[PDB]
Write a protein that binds this ligand. Structure first.
Ligand SMILES: *[C@@H]1O[C@H](CO)[C@@H](O)[C@H](O)[C@H]1NC(C)=O
Ligand SMILES: *[C@@H]1O[C@H](CO)[C@@H](O)[C@H](O)[C@H]1NC(C)=O
Ligand SMILES: *[C@@H]1O[C@H](CO)[C@@H](O)[C@H](O)[C@H]1NC(C)=O
Lengths: 55, 55, 55
């Protein structure tokens, strides 16, 4: 029964620019956070928890 | 029954610029945090917890 | 039943610039923290906990 609460108050501007390039690469895993982020945030990329892939 | 609470108060500006390049590379795992981030944040990239991949 | 609490108060500006380059490399694992980060933060990259990958 866990409760939550989030609150944010910004007044001036927030510029936020991202760029990602990949040329002739075999793999590129990227995770960029936000400019003003308040609260829980979970990211999972190319993970394997149980009974993975077989070949 | 764990509860949570997050709060943030910014007034001036937040510039935030990211860039990621990859040329003819076999692997690139990247994780960049945010400019003003308050609260929990979990990231997992190319991890293996149990029963992984087989070849 | 562990509870949490986070709070932040910034007034002036927060410039935050990141850059990552990789040219003809076989591996690049990177993790950059945020400019003003308050709170828990967990990162895991290319880790192996149990029953890993086989070849
Ligand atoms: C198994 O799964 C992972 C990601 O979960 C993937 O990268 C890999 O190519 C897979 N391997 C096989 C043998 O299926
Ligand atoms: C197993 O999984 C990992 C990531 O979880 C992946 O990098 C790797 O290519 C996989 N290996 C095999 C033999 O499937
Ligand atoms: C096993 O997993 C790790 C990452 O978890 C990966 O780097 C590696 O390529 C894998 N090795 C085999 C033999 O699958």
């Amino acid at each position: 029964e866990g409760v939550l609460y989030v609150g944010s108050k910004t007044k001036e501007g927030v510029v936020h620019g991202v760029a990602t390039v990949a040329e002739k690469t075999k793999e590129q895993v990227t995770n960029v956070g936000g400019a003003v982020v308040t609260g829980v945030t979970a990211v999972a990329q190319k993970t394997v928890e149980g009974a993975g892939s077989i070949a």
